[PDB]
Amino acid sequence: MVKLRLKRCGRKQRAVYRIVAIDVRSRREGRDLQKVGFYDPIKSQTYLNVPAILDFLEKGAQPTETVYDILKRAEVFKEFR
Amino acid sequence: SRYRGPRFKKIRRLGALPGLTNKRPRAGSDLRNQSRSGKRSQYRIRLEEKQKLRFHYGITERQLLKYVRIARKAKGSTGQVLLQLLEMRLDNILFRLGMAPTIPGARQLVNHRHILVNGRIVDIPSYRCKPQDTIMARDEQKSIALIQNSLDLSPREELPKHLTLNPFPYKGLVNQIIDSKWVGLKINELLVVEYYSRQ
Amino acid sequence: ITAYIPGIGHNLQEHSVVLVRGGRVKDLPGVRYHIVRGTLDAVGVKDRQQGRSKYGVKKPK
Amino acid sequence: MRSMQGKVICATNDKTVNVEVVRLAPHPKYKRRVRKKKKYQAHDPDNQFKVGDWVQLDKCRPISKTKTFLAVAPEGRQSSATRP
RNA sequence: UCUCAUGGAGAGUUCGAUCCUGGCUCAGGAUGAACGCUGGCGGCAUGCUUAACACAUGCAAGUCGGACGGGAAGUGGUGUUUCCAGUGGCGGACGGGUGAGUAACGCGUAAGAACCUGCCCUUGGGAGGGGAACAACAGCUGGAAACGGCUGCUAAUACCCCGUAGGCUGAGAAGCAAAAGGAGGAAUCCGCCCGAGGAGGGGCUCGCGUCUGAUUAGCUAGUUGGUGAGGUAAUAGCUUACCAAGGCGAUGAUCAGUAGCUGGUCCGAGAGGAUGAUCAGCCACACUGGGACUGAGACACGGCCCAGACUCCUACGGGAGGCAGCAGUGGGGAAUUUUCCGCAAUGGGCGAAAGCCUGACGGAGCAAUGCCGCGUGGAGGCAGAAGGCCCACGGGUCGUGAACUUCUUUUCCCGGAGAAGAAGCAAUGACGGUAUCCGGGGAAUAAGCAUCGGCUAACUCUGUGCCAGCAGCCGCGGUAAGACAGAGGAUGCAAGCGUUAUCCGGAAUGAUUGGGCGUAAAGCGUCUGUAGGUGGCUUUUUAAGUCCGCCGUCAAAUCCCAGGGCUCAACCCUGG
Ligand SMILES: [Mg+2]
Ligand SMILES: [Mg+2]
Ligand SMILES: [Mg+2]
Ligand SMILES: [Mg+2]
Ligand SMILES: [Mg+2]
Ligand SMILES: [Mg+2]
Ligand SMILES: [Mg+2]
Ligand SMILES: [Mg+2]
Ligand SMILES: [Mg+2]
Ligand SMILES: [Mg+2]
Ligand SMILES: [Mg+2]
Ligand SMILES: [Mg+2]
Ligand SMILES: [Mg+2]
Ligand SMILES: [Mg+2]
Ligand SMILES: [Mg+2]
Ligand SMILES: [Mg+2]
Ligand SMILES: [Mg+2]
Ligand SMILES: [Mg+2]
Ligand SMILES: [Mg+2]
Ligand SMILES: [Mg+2]
Ligand SMILES: [Mg+2]
Ligand SMILES: [Mg+2]
Ligand SMILES: [Mg+2]
Ligand SMILES: [Mg+2]
Ligand SMILES: [Mg+2]
Ligand SMILES: [Mg+2]
Ligand SMILES: [Mg+2]
Ligand SMILES: [Mg+2]
Ligand SMILES: [Mg+2]
Ligand SMILES: [Mg+2]
Known part of the structure; x- marks a missing residue:
């Protein structure tokens, strides 16, 4: 199954995540095939390219809890269906 | 990570260092020891030219050798680009403006949180100040007195073109990038590059 | 193998545990190793001030 | 270019027909093009080939152990018998 | 007078002396480091390279009562409700650890055809009617224990049959194939059966690249090839019977030895050399070997069966177990850590949901192991004095150094305030009263290590007398030692400094770039010739090599350029 989650890469006690689509059984720092966003809680900035994300969601990609919340604040679901 | 020693002991042998202290040596001690020293080797001449940078800026070889790599990566006049990194240090800029009598004296002011840059405190004597950067003191009367005492209790040297001063805040401002001919120390930069040719 | 005893004076005797390092002595053919002073059983050199780290000797105080 | 030619010895x-393939490639250390050789095994269900002929190979699903190619005729040749 | 180029240093030693040739040695940088002396703090990282030796103790994979029957607790021994040993469903094939084995489709790269694929997404059609069991449980019974035995009863999304079919078999006629219900103010969600697709994942095949040795030259017999009969999810000697005699190799077969591979790491002027820790991907292994079941998926680290070695329990009949999971112990070794806190975040599994589990992961602690950063005071200090060393005995040096006087408080001590990280109305923080800010006190809390014959920056005196001893090379010391030891002084580094070990460079000393063979090491005693290498001139053909323009790909991280963010840097992030 394909899934939209986020991996950690940064400094200790300074979390800086990036959104990416990879297989579920792969580990957190797994081989990527398409990076589709960037996010951090401290600065609270987000690019979140929509054309790539909709390509996976049409094919059955299931977001996680927080990635659902990130996409919820965006209006991507209304144009997705 | 600091000298903490006598300075005239080196100025007799090394050369002249206005950056360290404007004082001068007293005695041409003995003709005997000058006869003992005599000539000098080429490696020693390249060595003594390097040591002048170790005192005029208060820097370590590890801290210095890093700047050598940045100059080698930078294209054109690696000797000149080296001084562009040293002269832009905060410890030199606060000195050349005249806010302290000695660069070690200026290094202390930076360490004990007496100066701020662009509205923020800077506790790093090795901070690289960019063009169009403001340098102001803090609001405490202790901080204001130390800079005010430096600008009042003795004459002031003519400043460069790339530095200004507003006497109402007692502050400064960096205009542009330095030229290699406005260094505050008589240098032969090429010999320094010849010393680090091995490394 | 056989090693060299650097320094002046030693307390080593048969059935003692030493710690060997590299380095050869040209003047002695066949010797290609040195022992460390200030270790398991080899003690530091007595009355030594200069070059004190090369022989395992405490600093005077 | 894509497929491999070869001589059809043995x-x-x-x-089936054993086939000898030849290629040239530069030596990595000295950059000289050396003539290397490698054999393969193909199949011609019509048995339309014999020793001395020129043959082309194609990829296909495996027929047996070490025989994983198909023998076809050559595409680009330069016979040009007695042109002005 | 453009632009490109940011990059190549040598020194000593053969001789009485010189020019060469040729080895040895040094100056550089790096490390999963170790030892020695010394030692203030902070930030980011790292931490069994040896015995894949053996392991005490605790934890590391559970979850659903909204699938089912029973049982327990509580209550007003009554309703709701809470808990679960068993049946059933999903996950236990992910994640974690380790490189023993492996020289080959294992890895990397670039292509293919004869296949599978639970969960997710999309989509076309269905779920009708009946029956029989094992658990649990009840009774009896055998054992020291682990675990059982017998006799009867029972539910289900568990089992079986019938019926139906856009599917399967076949040339066709014909033959065969299913399902499960649960929750509910009833709209109606979670599911089940058949079939066709998408994505991801996995299996198979192939081109190219992929260590050493010729004092290993012949190897293979299901071996190369076909047919028929088999078999696998699928192609295939994958298996078998017969037939044919091929298949590999001197461009290195076979045999032997070594080794996880790669992105990358280090060195280098470059070409290239060495290397495969941390991070990331693939493969392989799970006490040593063999085998299969289950399932969409295994020949399964914390699953089962058998054999073997070892350890533990035993009532001696018989049983239990596999830290190359976290932490930790013993042992080996020069040498590498707490038997810690928490699921707050990230991610994973189950569940309709609430929530449960998660030694993965996120944090703390130990270590100067490494990289980076800041201190161990600034300024002034007239003249003179004590003291150490040296002297041509007049003086010189240690030395503005110290004393002394003022100034400041990173750091230090005391006392307060105090987060972000949390995404989700509110609440929800292991770290943590952590970072951080304000106030008070006061130079108060903080420098050592090596070297000083030449290479190689830095010198005298005393002592010793080829003695004690130094040394990387040349070599110093035999009574005035700049080479030993001490002292003073100096130089170079700096919370580090040196020694040793390992790799590269220097080394043009394996010379493609970039060497040589008259006498310094080097032309077979000579000739003929197989393979192989190269090959005269002129006009055409093709476009394999070669050159140009586009497309795809060589992951991310790292390196390079730019930009931004941590008070700067290391470092982190964005883009190319
Ligand atoms: Mg440092
Ligand atoms: Mg001589
Ligand atoms: Mg190991
Ligand atoms: Mg259910
Ligand atoms: Mg239960
Ligand atoms: Mg399953
Ligand atoms: Mg039926
Ligand atoms: Mg076989
Ligand atoms: Mg066949
Ligand atoms: Mg191995
Ligand atoms: Mg070279
Ligand atoms: Mg073991
Ligand atoms: Mg398992
Ligand atoms: Mg285990
Ligand atoms: Mg362990
Ligand atoms: Mg959690
Ligand atoms: Mg979670
Ligand atoms: Mg638990
Ligand atoms: Mg140490
Ligand atoms: Mg002073
Ligand atoms: Mg010298
Ligand atoms: Mg010595
Ligand atoms: Mg003497
Ligand atoms: Mg000496
Ligand atoms: Mg070479
Ligand atoms: Mg030669
Ligand atoms: Mg001769
Ligand atoms: Mg000769
Ligand atoms: Mg001939
Ligand atoms: Mg890349």
């Missing part, structure tokens, strides 16, 4: 076996 065509004795049934429904």
Whole structure:
């Protein structure tokens, strides 16, 4: 199954995540095939390219809890269906 | 990570260092020891030219050798680009403006949180100040007195073109990038590059 | 193998545990190793001030 | 370019023909083009090939152990018998 | 007078002396480091390279009562409700650890055809009617224990049959194939059966690249090839019977030895050399070997069966177990850590949901192991004095150094305030009263290590007398030692400094770039010739090599350029 989650890469006690689509059984720092966003809680900035994300969601990609919340604040679901 | 020693002991042998202290040596001690020293080797001449940078800026070889790599990566006049990194240090800029009598004296002011840059405190004597950067003191009367005492209790040297001063805040401002001919120390930069040719 | 005893004076005797390092002595053919002073059983050199780290000797105080 | 040509020596076996392939490639240390050789096994169900002929190979699903190619005719040749 | 180029240093030693040739040695940088002396703090990282030796103790994979029957607790021994040993469903094939084995489709790269694929997404059609069991449980019974035995009863999304079919078999006629219900103010969600697709994942095949040795030259017999009969999810000697005699190799077969591979790491002027820790991907292994079941998926680290070695329990009949999971112990070794806190975040599994589990992961602690950063005071200090060393005995040096006087408080001590990280109305923080800010006190809390014959920056005196001893090379010391030891002084580094070990460079000393063979090491005693290498001139053909323009790909991280963010840097992030 394909899934939209986020991996950690940064400094200790300074979390800086990036959104990416990879297989579920792969580990957190797994081989990527398409990076589709960037996010951090401290600065609270987000690019979140929509054309790539909709390509996976049409094919059955299931977001996680927080990635659902990130996409919820965006209006991507209304144009997705 | 600091000298903490006598300075005239080196100025007799090394050369002249206005950056360290404007004082001068007293005695041409003995003709005997000058006869003992005599000539000098080429490696020693390249060595003594390097040591002048170790005192005029208060820097370590590890801290210095890093700047050598940045100059080698930078294209054109690696000797000149080296001084562009040293002269832009905060410890030199606060000195050349005249806010302290000695660069070690200026290094202390930076360490004990007496100066701020662009509205923020800077506790790093090795901070690289960019063009169009403001340098102001803090609001405490202790901080204001130390800079005010430096600008009042003795004459002031003519400043460069790339530095200004507003006497109402007692502050400064960096205009542009330095030229290699406005260094505050008589240098032969090429010999320094010849010393680090091995490394 | 056989090693060299650097320094002046030693307390080593048969059935003692030493710690060997590299380095050869040209003047002695066949010797290609040195022992460390200030270790398991080899003690530091007595009355030594200069070059004190090369022989395992405490600093005077 | 895409597929490999070869000479069809040792065509004795049934429904199969051994084939010798040749290629040139530069030596990595000295950059000289050396003539290397490698053999393969193909199949011609019509048995339309014999020793001395020129043959082209194609990829296909495996027929047996070490025989994983198909023998076809050459595409680009330069016979040009007695042109002005 | 453009632009490109940011990059190549040598020194000593053969001789009485010189020019060469040729080895040895040094100056550089790096490390999963170790030892020695010394030692203030902070930030980011790292931490069994040896015995894949053996392991005490605790934890590391559970979850659903909204699938089912029973049982327990509580209550007003009554309703709701809470808990679960068993049946059933999903996950236990992910994640974690380790490189023993492996020289080959294992890895990397670039292509293919004869296949599978639970969960997710999309989509076309269905779920009708009946029956029989094992658990649990009840009774009896055998054992020291682990675990059982017998006799009867029972539910289900568990089992079986019938019926139906856009599917399967076949040339066709014909033959065969299913399902499960649960929750509910009833709209109606979670599911089940058949079939066709998408994505991801996995299996198979192939081109190219992929260590050493010729004092290993012949190897293979299901071996190369076919047919028929088999078999696998699928192609295939994958298996078998017969037939044919091929298949590999001197461009290195076979045999032997070594080794996880790669992105990358280090060195280098470059070409290239060495290397495969941390991070990331693939493969392989799970006490040593063999085998299979289950399932969409295994020949399964914390699953089962058998054999073997070892350890533990035993009532001696018989049983239990596999830290190359976290932490930790013993042992080996020069040498590498707490038997810690928490699921707050990230991610994973189950569940309709609430929530449960998660030694993965996120944090703390130990270590100067490494990289980076800041201190161990600034300024002034007239003249003179004590003291150490040296002297041509007049003086010189240690030395503005110290004393002394003022100034400041990173750091230090005391006392307060105090987060972000949390995404989700509110609440929800292991770290943590952590970072951080304000106030008070006061130079108060903080420098050592090596070297000083030449290479190689830095010198005298005393002592010793080829003695004690130094040394990387040349070599110093035999009574005035700049080479030993001490002292003073100096130089170079700096919370580090040196020694040793390992790799590269220097080394043009394996010379493609970039060497040589008259006498310094080097032309077979000579000739003929196989393979192989190269090959005269002129006009055409093709476009394999070669050159140009586009497309795809060589992951991310790292390196390079730019930009931004941590008070700067290391470092982190964005883009190319
Ligand atoms: Mg440092
Ligand atoms: Mg001589
Ligand atoms: Mg190991
Ligand atoms: Mg259910
Ligand atoms: Mg239960
Ligand atoms: Mg399953
Ligand atoms: Mg039926
Ligand atoms: Mg076989
Ligand atoms: Mg066949
Ligand atoms: Mg191995
Ligand atoms: Mg070179
Ligand atoms: Mg073991
Ligand atoms: Mg398992
Ligand atoms: Mg285990
Ligand atoms: Mg362990
Ligand atoms: Mg959690
Ligand atoms: Mg979670
Ligand atoms: Mg638990
Ligand atoms: Mg140490
Ligand atoms: Mg002073
Ligand atoms: Mg010298
Ligand atoms: Mg010595
Ligand atoms: Mg003497
Ligand atoms: Mg000496
Ligand atoms: Mg070479
Ligand atoms: Mg030669
Ligand atoms: Mg001769
Ligand atoms: Mg000769
Ligand atoms: Mg001939
Ligand atoms: Mg890349």
